[model samples]
Target: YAIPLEDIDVSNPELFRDNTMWGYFERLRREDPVHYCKDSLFGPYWSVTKFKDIMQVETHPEIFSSEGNITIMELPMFIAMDPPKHDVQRMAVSPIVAPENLAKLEGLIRERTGRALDGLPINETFDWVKLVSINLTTQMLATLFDFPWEDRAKLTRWSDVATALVGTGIIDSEEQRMEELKGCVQYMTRLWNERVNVPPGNDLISMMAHTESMRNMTPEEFLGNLILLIVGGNDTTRNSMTGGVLALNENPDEYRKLCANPALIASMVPEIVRWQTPLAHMRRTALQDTELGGKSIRKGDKVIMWYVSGNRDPEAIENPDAFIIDRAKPRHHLSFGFGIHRCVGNRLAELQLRIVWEELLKRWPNPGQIEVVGAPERVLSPFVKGYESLPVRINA
Candidate 1:
């Protein structure tokens, strides 16, 4: 609390790595709801901290444009473009998670989930992020792209290469980042060509190859969107996969509530998404002047909608800090974002989390059965709010 109001920069990556961001966000929501930092690593920007204000910015994309990029770092993918173009590319990718496809994949997903869960070491502490979350999430990603199973680990590796900053472990320098990404584009192109030569299939590559809007994409656009899909499909759900285990262990009473009635898994799914908030904030470059939360925002200003803070705002969520297994409005949070660009695979993400938890409760059908044994290593990026590692164990 000693820090001056104007000096507080919520964009600092240090706070996220230390798990100390909540205090900064909490202070922002109360004292200066639409606060601006004169300077930050991601540059000077306005932070939209409240739930209602965030929705306003999201729905009014014309004013708060996502054309430049959707992150503090930035990208050239479909996620970064405004519609007509955004809607067109989004159309090409949306059908991958259609209701019919999801139903068809459920059994295969369950089978894979079961195998992963069964493989966990009994009563031995292990990195759940590795063994379960990343492992299973990558498997599903491979299935989506029809990527070769033998090289599926590359999918997870490439997400870090795609998002990791130069100093981060994934790449030590811009040259290193570029070198790895060069290989990524080539590999992605080879697979894209492989799909183009074959009859259309149910995977993402085929879906895009067969579509009118994306079939003739340039190399940059193709790799850019593919990397977007990789990170979008991989990190968000991957983190939440481990996020649920950690949340349950932290709130033992809620865990007991879940064990008492496994059916609460349906409601608890979204609760996990809100609590975890895989992607913390999405960046927008203001197209023109706008007013939000009584604050005047000028054109060309960078805007950040803090989804993490809004998910916990007392004005929007009752007992906002508490982990309730059966919240009446579980899915009302800002985790999936809003407007035309809301997460395309939201249901598929929820479905995977729900299915995994169901299979989990079936095996260890009691409180304290699945346990977290150590402190989680939080990701260093302020944008991708997730765990790097979470030590866990399932007691027999």
Candidate 2:
């Protein structure tokens, strides 16, 4: 018999830490695609597990509103806003990831990736999460904001604090989280004031300061949006970096396939994103009573589109759980989400991952063996399905 639906509260971080979330979601997809939890840490919310049902909720944002929040916890940001406003604010910083811009960024990404990988100590266990994943992503993030290169790690810290739950051990208390975020706001406000007086530039902060839609935003609003961009740019790519290595190590045949034909790096990038499903779910509030997957959802109800589950739905993806580097349709995944609020920096994220793999293969053409040195230390929140540490050793 399947576990009771009420017993499957996915928001519990322990499920993710133990890597047993897939089992819970698999049961939900089979027995209750539109499952509801009347009580949980994040309060009552509907869990939409099937791929088709998630698409239905995502495409019809008019009915499933994003006005309040995108995660279980309410945060005021453009990602949580509906229509015109989300469009305008998103456009302000969208140029940084435009094709022409990414074309320029590719060379820099490859150069830095080569440097990072070359510096790794072979035959010694290392925390890939810090040495590679965080370093490369933090560099790209700093470039996006034109943040001081020396203090780029601050971006990573604030990104974690922004998404961290109060008692999750990431932060001691909500007061500490707020104080640190206040520091982020104060720091960014100084940069905003400085940028507004200058000619427009390609960096995100400059674009936001100069753009009419965002130029007059209040400090709190500006901070909220900044947090959105920071976490958006930071987490997905950072975790995917770690996930790619883990996936390849776990699936040696696919890793060997990738090594034999490095050309597959392009396809492998999206596969890693799909396999990781870095951000587990995005929450939406119902504007009107709606039915999804034969379940009645009332107006003002909280609905969560579990991307992690949807990515694994067998109806949409054949062999959904397998790590197929060269899947026939690699991009057919909900990791970057869908609709107007889809990830704007998706191209950039893929670019970073692709370049890293390209550089990895170039350096270690025959990475003979890799072994997981210890259990991956998972992040303490369900919102971000990522790692705090992944100990591994690669041998030539």
Candidate 3:
């Protein structure tokens, strides 16, 4: 059922939802690594599918700029800015996810992770995405903002709303999106107001509230950063949690190795990220007419680096789709983008994934104890490649 090469458009959200996107990306990676779609739901854009081609675009930020937008649905976060402004605003939040900060957080993360896993009912069907993935991620974000203990699920909602495609049921239209986000802004503004009046503190809200370079940001910029931090902290890691379990279920051999050698969990953490490729693609606007993959990229054109496709490119990653838990260089994947705009919170994401897996393996050493009992419901969006629900059961 191959569509004609000229008619191919990988940006379609249905492809991602149905898990049928691989063949399209494979075709483009081989025949047209920098293929362009003259029309799309988000307008015309070029797809950079192969690993080397994506690295070329990522490393040359001057040629392919992040300034215009980073997603098909435009948002103006610091991630979408170029140079000085991006640098400064990024600095304001960097310390929170910094190595030392993550080290300090190890106990809290482990405690929360252990608590969540320990509370799961044994031998009953449940949605792992709801119980473990979303639950633990929400706890972390709640700790980040010192957000109200019981209401932190709103952060997950805001994260999903920020990146949702219309008709995904989460959002009905752009108008509804705006309304939902206004709720986020108003709620956050109250927190910001409270924090700014107090002494400088270390929470994410307090850090920005207290930072000289960030404190004076406009309302729009404030909202942008909120979107960035929310999605970065919640969506990426949450999906990867669900992904690891599903990956293991799909590849029982890998699960066998992991259960036999829990030490493999460290390497499996990065492998999970690569296998999920959570943020499927990051869009960049070309700064000048350039040549990529022997194809002409015009100035101001939208070029999407399909990290989902690139991570599976065999030349860059050996046996790219096998989900091997102990690959030689498990970190060598495009899920975190590359160059200056590489994911800021990547280490924190790794930490969360590692802690969760460590606790799970500690609790259940059996190979098939935590089984995926039903089909996963994948999110209906190209940008946030994740699951909405993944059913599982503990077969104790």
Residue-level lDDT of model 1, residues 200-318, one tens digit each, is 96777787777776756676887788777777878988998888888898899999898889999999999999999899999899888878999999999888899999999999999
What is the full ranking by TM-score, best candidate first?
1, 3, 2
lDDT for model 3 comes to 0.85
For each candidate, the alpha-carbon lDDT, in order, equals: 0.86, 0.83, 0.85
- Give the TM-score comparing model 1 with the true structure, all chains together: 0.96
Lowest summed-lDDT stretch of 10 residues in model 2?
96-105
Q: What is the C-alpha RMSD of each candidate to the true structure, in Å?
A: 1.6, 1.9, 1.7
Query: What does candidate 2's lDDT look like per residue over 1-396, in tens digits?
Result: 365667789888788888888888888898888999987888899999999999999899889998867888753687878987878777766775665665554666567668777788889999988888898899877766778888888988888898988877679988898899889888887887888888967677776776676655666777788777877778888899899888987888997898788999988999999999999999999999988999889999999999999999999999998999888889999998899988888887787777777777776776445566777898877889999999988786
Candidate 3 per-residue lDDT over residues 8-95, each given as its tens digit: 9898899988999999998888887889898678888999999999999988888988885688765468887898887877777677
- Residue runs of model 3 more than 4 Å from their true location after superposition: 74-76, 102-104, 215-219
Model 2 misses residue 196 by how many Å?
Answer: 2.5
Q: Of the candidates numbered 1 and 2, which has the greater lDDT value?
A: 1
- N/CA/C clash count, model 3: 0
> Which model, 2 or 3, shows the larger lDDT?
3
lDDT of 2 at 129: 89
